[PDB]
Design an enzyme around this catalytic site. Structure first.
Site, short mmCIF file in Angstrom:
data_model
loop_
_atom_site.label_atom_id
_atom_site.label_comp_id
_atom_site.label_asym_id
_atom_site.label_seq_id
_atom_site.Cartn_x
_atom_site.Cartn_y
_atom_site.Cartn_z
N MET A 1 57.45 58.95 -22.84
CA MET A 1 57.13 59.36 -21.23
C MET A 1 56.62 57.98 -20.41
SD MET A 1 53.92 61.83 -20.53
CE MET A 1 53.37 62.43 -18.66
N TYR B 1 52.06 73.17 -5.39
CA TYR B 1 52.16 72.17 -4.38
C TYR B 1 53.18 72.48 -3.57
CZ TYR B 1 49.70 69.19 -8.01
OH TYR B 1 48.99 68.86 -8.91
N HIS C 1 48.38 74.43 -15.69
CA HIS C 1 47.73 73.70 -14.75
C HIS C 1 46.24 73.80 -14.75
CE1 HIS C 1 48.46 72.47 -10.31
NE2 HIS C 1 47.80 71.58 -10.72
N1 LIG Z 1 46.47 68.57 -12.71
C1 LIG Z 1 45.86 68.65 -11.87
O1 LIG Z 1 44.93 69.67 -11.61
C2 LIG Z 1 46.07 67.65 -10.54
C3 LIG Z 1 45.04 67.49 -9.63
C4 LIG Z 1 45.06 66.49 -8.59
C5 LIG Z 1 46.36 65.62 -8.75
N2 LIG Z 1 47.15 65.86 -9.52
C6 LIG Z 1 48.43 64.92 -9.64
O2 LIG Z 1 47.86 63.73 -9.27
C7 LIG Z 1 48.54 63.12 -8.28
C8 LIG Z 1 47.70 61.75 -7.54
O3 LIG Z 1 46.36 62.39 -7.32
P1 LIG Z 1 46.37 62.71 -5.71
O4 LIG Z 1 47.35 63.26 -5.04
O5 LIG Z 1 45.07 63.65 -5.91
O6 LIG Z 1 45.58 61.34 -5.14
P2 LIG Z 1 45.80 59.98 -5.33
O7 LIG Z 1 47.00 59.40 -5.91
O8 LIG Z 1 44.46 59.24 -6.09
O9 LIG Z 1 45.53 59.36 -3.85
C9 LIG Z 1 46.52 59.81 -2.90
C10 LIG Z 1 46.18 59.32 -1.64
O10 LIG Z 1 46.23 57.94 -1.71
C11 LIG Z 1 47.00 57.24 -0.53
N3 LIG Z 1 47.76 55.77 -0.89
C12 LIG Z 1 48.64 55.83 -2.08
N4 LIG Z 1 48.94 54.59 -2.22
C13 LIG Z 1 48.15 53.80 -1.36
C14 LIG Z 1 47.82 52.60 -1.47
N5 LIG Z 1 48.72 51.59 -2.00
N6 LIG Z 1 47.21 52.01 -0.55
C15 LIG Z 1 46.23 52.90 0.14
N7 LIG Z 1 46.19 54.35 0.32
C16 LIG Z 1 47.28 54.76 -0.60
C17 LIG Z 1 47.92 58.36 -0.35
O11 LIG Z 1 48.37 58.31 1.11
P3 LIG Z 1 49.84 58.47 1.54
O12 LIG Z 1 50.70 59.59 0.64
O13 LIG Z 1 49.80 58.85 3.14
O14 LIG Z 1 50.63 57.04 1.50
C18 LIG Z 1 47.07 59.91 -0.42
O15 LIG Z 1 46.24 59.73 0.84
C19 LIG Z 1 48.78 64.27 -7.46
O16 LIG Z 1 49.73 64.03 -6.31
C20 LIG Z 1 49.28 65.23 -8.43
O17 LIG Z 1 50.61 64.88 -8.73
C21 LIG Z 1 47.31 66.92 -10.74
O1 LIG Z 2 45.09 71.55 -8.53
C1 LIG Z 2 45.82 70.39 -8.05
O2 LIG Z 2 46.79 70.14 -8.89
C2 LIG Z 2 45.11 69.79 -7.16
O3 LIG Z 2 44.05 70.75 -6.51
C3 LIG Z 2 44.58 71.77 -5.75
C4 LIG Z 2 45.79 71.59 -5.26
C5 LIG Z 2 46.27 72.65 -4.29
CL1 LIG Z 2 48.12 72.82 -3.51
C6 LIG Z 2 45.47 73.59 -3.76
C7 LIG Z 2 44.38 73.83 -4.40
C8 LIG Z 2 43.75 72.66 -5.20
C9 LIG Z 2 42.35 72.83 -5.75
O4 LIG Z 2 41.66 73.43 -5.01
N1 LIG Z 2 42.33 72.45 -7.03
C10 LIG Z 2 41.05 72.66 -7.91
C11 LIG Z 2 40.86 73.85 -8.81
C12 LIG Z 2 41.96 74.75 -8.84
C13 LIG Z 2 41.95 75.83 -9.76
C14 LIG Z 2 40.75 76.12 -10.76
C15 LIG Z 2 39.78 74.81 -10.73
N2 LIG Z 2 38.75 75.04 -11.52
O5 LIG Z 2 38.19 74.07 -11.45
O6 LIG Z 2 38.86 75.93 -12.61
C16 LIG Z 2 40.01 73.92 -9.76
#
Ligand SMILES: NC(=O)c1ccc[n+]([C@@H]2O[C@H](COP(=O)([O-])OP(=O)(O)OC[C@H]3O[C@@H](n4cnc5c(N)ncnc54)[C@H](OP(=O)(O)O)[C@@H]3O)[C@@H](O)[C@H]2O)c1
Ligand SMILES: O=C(O)COc1cc(Cl)ccc1C(=O)NCc1cccc([N+](=O)[O-])c1
EC number: 1.1.1.21
Length: 315
Positions: A12, A48, A110
């Site tokens: 990965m 998303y 998720h």
């Molecule tokens: N599993 C889950 O529950 C979960 C939850 C949250 C996130 N995720 C995954 O994690 C990924 C990353 O987390 P995130 O989207 O929450 O936030 P992040 O990657 O911490 O931050 C994204 C933010 O930072 C900005 N940014 C990116 N590169 C930058 C740089 N070099 N300088 C300044 N600003 C910059 C982006 O702006 P622009 O895009 O406008 O450039 C966007 O506003 C998500 O997109 C998602 O794929 C999964």
């Molecule tokens: O989940 C993600 O990847 C980022 O968070 C998102 C993204 C989108 Cl498109 C919409 C809503 C959320 C959000 O409220 N996530 C928080 C969340 C959700 C469900 C349960 C929990 N939980 O804590 O059980 C938390």
């Protein structure tokens, strides 16, 4: 190394592109640029609402002969409203169809919480509470295992599971596949030392999400701590002639984590990839870990009462 070995024998990429909050009107271009500059891992999810547009990008670059499928590591996630065993395959196949793929490299649960099935992603009652489903983690996990057995996905894993919830799966009699990955929030304000220690001790790879603090999260408050603007981190970055983001992405790489920063801005997409040409020192690492505040950007208070809400436990 650029890639980490999973329990299914697959490698990965430790740096991937996040896609939450990448609008459909801009994510195709983001993914094309990311592939051009070297990304091979893309983090996706049905919730998303942009997987079609992600799949357009991948299709195009395959057709341009820039990459082939085997070189890509595409991750998606089963949303909370599809935890019932009868709905999982459908959800996976929808994601595959949208992404125009015939397999996923990794498919995650998720969130551990199951929500009432239906069209709404966040089904609420009249008083704002999220409506749960009568589903459980073990049954959902068995449905995920079936996806591997049928070749829809090469590996399965979890996301936002506390260590007790991971243990539930590990300790399931008749388990067929151990989770390969646990994808959790992780950054200098939420360093996750105990959950990472647990996971890595059980042979589960950890992916750090929101590594830059998700400044674009839709529930942000102005007074919330801001990683990218933290002057202490800016100081560490300046001494390496790197940006704060680069420091923030390199930090989990050196903890043997996978990391998935999101951007739709071409220059930032490239900037963010330029993290394999420097090393944070031992002091840098110690310093960054010391900023922990057990501060989460990603939680859901309207689901706090869910039986499986993950963040009541210490870790
Ligand atoms: N599993 C889950 O529950 C979960 C939850 C949250 C996130 N995720 C995954 O994690 C990924 C990353 O987390 P995130 O989207 O929450 O936030 P992040 O990657 O911490 O931050 C994204 C933010 O930072 C900005 N940014 C990116 N590169 C930058 C740089 N070099 N300088 C300044 N600003 C910059 C982006 O702006 P622009 O895009 O406008 O450039 C966007 O506003 C998500 O997109 C998602 O794929 C999964
Ligand atoms: O989940 C993600 O990847 C980022 O968070 C998102 C993204 C989108 Cl498109 C919409 C809503 C959320 C959000 O409220 N996530 C928080 C969340 C959700 C469900 C349960 C929990 N939980 O804590 O059980 C938390």
């Amino acid at each position: 190394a650029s890639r980490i070995l999973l329990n299914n024998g697959a490698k990965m990429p430790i740096l991937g592109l996040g896609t939450w909050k990448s609008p459909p009107g801009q994510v195709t271009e983001a993914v094309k640029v990311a592939i051009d500059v070297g990304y091979r891992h893309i983090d996706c999810a049905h919730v998303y609402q942009n997987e079609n547009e992600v799949g357009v990008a991948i299709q195009e670059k395959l057709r341009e002969q820039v990459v082939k499928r085997e070189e890509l590591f595409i991750v998606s996630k089963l949303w909370c409203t599809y935890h019932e065993k009868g709905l999982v395959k459908g959800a996976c196949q929808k994601t595959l169809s949208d992404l125009k793929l015939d397999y996923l490299d990794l498919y995650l649960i998720h969130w551990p919480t199951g929500f009432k099935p239906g069209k709404e992603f966040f089904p609420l009652d009249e008083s704002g509470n999220v409506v749960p489903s009568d589903t459980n983690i073990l049954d959902t996990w068995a449905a995920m295992e079936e996806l591997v057995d049928e070749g829809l996905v090469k590996a399965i894993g979890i996301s936002n599971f506390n260590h007790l919830q991971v243990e539930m799966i590990l300790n399931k009699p008749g388990l067929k596949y151990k989770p390969a990955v646990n994808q959790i929030e992780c950054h200098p304000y939420l360093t996750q030392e105990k959950l990472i220690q647990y996971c890595q001790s059980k042979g589960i790879v950890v992916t750090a999400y929101s590594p830059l603090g998700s400044p674009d999260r839709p529930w942000a408050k102005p007074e919330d701590p801001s990683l990218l603007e933290d002057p202490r981190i800016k100081a560490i970055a300046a001494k390496h002639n790197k940006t704060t983001a680069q420091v923030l992405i390199r930090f989990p790489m050196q903890r043997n984590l996978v990391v998935i920063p999101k951007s739709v801005t071409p220059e930032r997409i490239a900037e963010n990839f330029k993290v394999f040409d420097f090393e944070l020192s031992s002091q840098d690492m110690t310093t960054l870990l010391s900023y922990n505040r057990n501060w989460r950007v990603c939680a859901l208070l309207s689901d706090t009462s869910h039986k499986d809400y993950p963040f009541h436990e210490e870790f």
